[PDB]
Amino acid sequence: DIVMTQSPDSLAVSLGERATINCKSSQSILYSSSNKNYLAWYQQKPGQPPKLLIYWASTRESGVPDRFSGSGSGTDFTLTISSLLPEDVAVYYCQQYHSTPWTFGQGTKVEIK
Amino acid sequence: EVQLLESGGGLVQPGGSLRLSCAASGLTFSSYAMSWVRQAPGKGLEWVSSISASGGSTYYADSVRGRFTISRDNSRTTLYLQMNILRAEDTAVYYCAKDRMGVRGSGWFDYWGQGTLVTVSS
Amino acid sequence: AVVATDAYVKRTNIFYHASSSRLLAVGHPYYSIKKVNKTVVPKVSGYQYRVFKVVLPDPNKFALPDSSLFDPTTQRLVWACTGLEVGRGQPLGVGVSGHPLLNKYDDVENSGGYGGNPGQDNRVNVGMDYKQTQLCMVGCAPPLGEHWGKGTQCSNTSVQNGDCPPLELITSVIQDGDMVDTGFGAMNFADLQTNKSDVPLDICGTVCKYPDYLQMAADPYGDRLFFYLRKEQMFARHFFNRAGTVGEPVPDDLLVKGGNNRSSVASSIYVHTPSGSLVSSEAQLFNKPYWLQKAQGHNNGICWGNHLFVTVVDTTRSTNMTLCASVSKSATYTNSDYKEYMRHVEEFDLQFIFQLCSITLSAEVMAYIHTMNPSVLEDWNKQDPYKDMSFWEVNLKEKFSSELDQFPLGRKFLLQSGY
Amino acid sequence: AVVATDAYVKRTNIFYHASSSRLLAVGHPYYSIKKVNKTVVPKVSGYQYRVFKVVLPDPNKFALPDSSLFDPTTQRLVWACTGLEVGRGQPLGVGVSGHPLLNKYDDVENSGGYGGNPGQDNRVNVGMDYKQTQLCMVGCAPPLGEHWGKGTQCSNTSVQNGDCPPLELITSVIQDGDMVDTGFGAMNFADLQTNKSDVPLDICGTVCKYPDYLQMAADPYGDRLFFYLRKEQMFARHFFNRAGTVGEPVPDDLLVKGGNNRSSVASSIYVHTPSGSLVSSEAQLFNKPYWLQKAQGHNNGICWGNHLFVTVVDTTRSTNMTLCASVSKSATYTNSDYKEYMRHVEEFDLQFIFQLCSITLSAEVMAYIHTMNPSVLEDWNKQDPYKDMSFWEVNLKEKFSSELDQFPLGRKFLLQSGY
Amino acid sequence: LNKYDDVENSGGYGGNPGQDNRVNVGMDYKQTQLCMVGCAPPLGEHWGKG
Amino acid sequence: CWGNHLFVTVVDTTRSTNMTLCASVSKSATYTNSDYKEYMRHVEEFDLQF
Amino acid sequence: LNKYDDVENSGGYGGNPGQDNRVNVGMDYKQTQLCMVGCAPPLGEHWGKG
Amino acid sequence: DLLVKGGNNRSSVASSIYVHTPSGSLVSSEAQLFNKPYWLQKAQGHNNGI
Amino acid sequence: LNKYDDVENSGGYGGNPGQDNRVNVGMDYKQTQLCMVGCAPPLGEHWGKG
Secondary structure, three states: OOOOEEOOOOEEEOOOOOEEEEEEOOOOOEEOOOOEEOEEEEEEOOOOOOEEEEEOOOEEOOOOOOOEEEEEEOOEEEEEEOOOOHHHOEEEEEEEOOOOOOEEOOOEEEEEO | OOOEEEEOOEEEOOOOOEEEEEEEOOOOOOOOOEEEEEEOOOOOEEEEEEEOOOOOOEEEOOOOOOOEEEEEEOOOOEEEEEEOOOOHHHOEEEEEEEOOOOOOOOOOOOOEOOOEEEEEOO | OOOOHHHHOEEEEEEEEEEOOOEEEEEEOOOOEEOOOOEEEOEOOOOEOEEEEEEOOOOOOOOOOOOOOOOOOOEEEEEEEEEEEEEEOOOOEOOOEEEEEEEOOEEOOOOOOOOOOOOOOOEEEEEEOOOEEEEEEEEOOOOEEEEEEEOOOOOOOOOOOOOOOOEEEEEEEOOOOOEEOOOOOOEEHHHHOOOOOOOOOOOOOOEEEEEOHHHHHHOOOOOOOOEEEEEEEOEEEEEEEOOOEEOOOOOHHHOOOOOHHHOOOOOOOEEEEEEOOOEEOOOOOOOOOEEOOOOOOOOOOEEOOOEEEEEEEEOOEOOOEEEEEEOOOOOOOOHHHEEEEEEEEEEEEEEEEEEEEEEEOOHHHHHHHHHHOHHHHHHOOOOOHHHOOOOEEEEOOOOOEOOHHHOHHHHHHHHHHOO | OOOOHHHHEEEEEEEEEEEEEEEEEEEEOOOOEOOOOOOOEOEOOOOEOEEEEEEOOOOOOOOOOOOOOOOOOOEEEEEEEEEEEEEEOOOOOOOOEEEEEEEOOOEOOOOOOOOOOOOOOOEEEEEEOOOEEEEEEEEOOOOEEEEEEEOOOOOOOOOOOOOOOOEEEEEEEOOOOOEEOOOOOOEEOOOOOOOOOOOOOOOOOOEEEEEOHHHHOOOOOOOOOOEEEEEEEEEEEEEEOOOOEEOOOOOOOOOOOOOHHHOOOOOOOOEEEEEOOOOOOOOOOOOOOEEOOOOOOOOOOEEOOOEEEEEEEEOOOOOOEEEEEEOOOOOOOOHHHEEEEEEEEEEEEEEEEEEEEEEEOOHHHHHHHHHHOHHHHHHOOOOOOOOOOOOEEEEOOOOOEOOHHHOHHHHHHHHHHOO | OOOOOOOOOOOOOOOOOOOOOOOOOOOOOOOOEEEEEEOOOOOOOOOOOO | OOOOOOEEEEEEOOOOOOEEEEEEOOOOOOOOOOOEEEEEEOOOOOOOOO | OOOOOOOOOOOOOOOOOOOOOOOOOOOOOOOOOOOOOOOOOOOOOOOOOO | OOOOOOOHHHOOOOOOOOOOOOOOOOOOOOOOOOOOOOOOOOOOOOOOOO | OEOOOOHHHOOOOOOOOOOOOEOOOOOOOOOOOOOOOOOOOOOOOOOOOO
């Protein structure tokens, strides 16, 4: 079973600054023929169901602010919040849907400083 | 305008059974595959079980296989989870999640339910 | 008036056996792959009509064993069909067709939903198998086939876009490669349906026909068919629903209106999926000799103009084989190392036994034959609609032989006749 | 020209009965287990051709009641077959085949919406049962079988990798242990499918064959089959796709392009799952005697060269039993304490009644036989074409006896004939 | 059409009906072939309100 | 046949394929399906001989 | 009706019932036809408490 | 040599011991053997019902 | 009863057989009828450990 490790621990980002979060798998996720990385990034607020942020490791969901971004390949991935606002305090998770069982990360808690 | 409502949580003695249900409001239910996702109190998100759009095929995790069961009701537009031989490790909050693709579905979820709490103790 | 051929043709005791030998066709089962140049791979399927035009040698020029047994001036000769056998090869199987994007809004057998509205392009990948059919026909002219086509709208109020096209029953000639109805009807799917996503690929761009037994039976002379056999079966497997704007809404008096999300009445165009139950060796018609004893009409198996037309449909052996080719080789089973192809192969062996007949051309006989078919008289001494039609030409000019006992059908014929 | 065997061969009243006693075979049903030495455990399956070569004693050499009737110098003797019975044991059943890693993407019989494109290695564990077949043929020479194989391309432009291989119809001789068509195709699955994951483990690396009746019925002498019986049936259970790049995409004019989530057209290579129907005992062909009276060729049940070939296929008794062996013992049912094995067992009983025949060797008769077969005349005083071929050899040299009533089939024969 | 629940193989009591629980249903009918010939039109029986 | 009359009653449900027709009101790039109107028709063909 | 689980093609271990696991079930019976004629009323057998 | 090796969780080939579940088709009264007398006309063997 | 997966519609490589994966299974058997008459008790054949 693919174990996803979120390298940065719960980190506090200053006001109006970028935030970076790294996700790593124990197997290669990329498919070489079509250049597809099977990775999704979710956001959850305290007490509410989590909301989708990124899919295919690059594409962005409708209604999601452009401030978020995702990148990476192979076994390394990063999610970056270009600008920080008070509404972005949440807990973020990375999921792989390359192979069953579909596993989520341990979750990283992002909070203002 | 798509909503998901869950019902069936409560206390139950160890070894007993339970049933959860999830109702979808403004959605073409017959198209999208769906899943149940557990979350322990204070821990991370864990997959449980998934069903095909037409209900033909189902998938379970290793720790869940044999005890739980997932079912579909397209005419009444409801999703069922039957829980058998409960343990103390299953006290958590359960989520009714909707996939993106239809026939078997790629494993990322667009909309989620509100979540219902299941407790197994004395 | 019309008189039977028995009245004015006399039969002799000369018998001949002709075999076409093994015939093969290989090609794609759905469409025909043509490159920029031409059609390298034809379209071969089990749900197609097989029309064989068999060409016989001219009995007049053909050197008979005896030329002194007939009058060279006052008599002519013609070939009369006596028996035949159609041999198929390959194992029994069934063929799967479908559409990657087919119009199927919802399942209505054990599902009915009144949730969200139907958006644009609700199409699904659907595969099925067709209705089971077998048929064999023999005649002098290609058979007639009926289908339903768009009618001609005359001088009237100009129709708005979207009005129901008028329907007409169009009769035509069944040529080689024309498809057969598969449980969706017998219509010109190219003209009566515009979306091009309502039926599987192998019929969504062509016409499906059904033999016209009533008119072919009502014909006066009886040259269209001497002999036919048919056997078909199907059942309804799944019921579903089509998506689109409804042309004719349900009348108010037939239902009680609903509320909330039930106010919008769902689509009411209901369709099913055909199937064929079981293929078994005890229901087949081929690989069996038929002795054409008495014709249904007046033409009693006489072949005018040295022609013969044999029509075959057989969906009992219709397996579509799948081939795989390896573009490259990688470490552990990449899906992009392999290319997939679909093929269908069809094999025949047609065997016939013919008899010789002679006609005495008196005044009444000459006049009657002139009234019936002027070509028969003009030949005994030319534009023909068969010129532009596509058939499968089987030539038997150098395959006649009277050594009956040396061929299988010859042995069966000699044993059956007893003498 | 070819004459019937009834002319130059004269039968006698000297009947004989022989039997092969019980024949047993035990082995793995999918692949033959072999250690570093060789095949310790053979491969025995219910979907294999069983070809028995029965070797008969020489009529001239062995003992006769009296030699006053025949002339040793001006005459010779051959053995002719006049009846047989093939008896099978073990209860009726159905055998299950499968593949741990089979190429199957989606089940398209009934679905909703679209899903994404295949990744790499989308392969699943699939089991199924096959098309139901049972046949039996008998002849002097081994039967022929047809299949579809890769073709050799002549001198032309060098083909790029991944092209569709050309197809050829190949005819060969069936040997003991060859597989049968199973509703997937009668084709070479080892050459034409390179991924090795498209059909179950039985036939994923072998050649399926189908009897070639059309050409064995057109042999000039007809030594390949005296008689044959066959019964087949199947139906289609499930339908599904395949994963891999499509060699020939759907033409641009046959479909209307979609948008958004229906943009990428799904795979249009459709396959079904065969299934035999209900197994019964009233449909059986075996455990029933057959009386050879008239053959379909010219050779009327006369054995040349003191050998005979029997080909049998029976898939109605094909249960794979399962055995379990205990490695150790634990407290509460450890799953790793047991080891699971698969066996298949087959049991046969072949019984024949033969008749003694004499041939008068005149000059023209001798010339005719020499033209037909040189080995026959050579032996009436070498390398056989069966040097490399495989058969199940059954010797019946010391098993001929004229006490007909003492054996079960002899009483049936005496009831039938009456004398 | 007035269909509520599928009782061929059922599990649990989901609940009681509300108002307007009707679904879109299709099916195929009983198979019949029939031919009468007579001088007068045939009589047919049915069940009506008393 | 009294009065120069006959009555023939026929029921045959074994040929009851409901044909579906589609007509186009407009043309769009990517299959809007609001362009298409769907109609349904059924046809009976008879031939009585006495 | 008293019915706990479906055991035909249902993987899963056996849970212990609680109280009143009954469900609403419908079916159809075995097909039968019978006709007898006599002078005395016919006899019939069944199994009862002894 | 009978398979092409997979990767990731496909590396360990799954079990290949396949079993099925039997079932009789239909019970009917026209297929019974019993409740009908049998007359031993001629035996198959030498002992003729002694 | 020892059963792991229903390979008819399954085969996902997402788990391995653990310890004690047995499930409750019910079924009906192959349908048989047989009647034999003989002076001596009939023989039967089975497969036993060697």
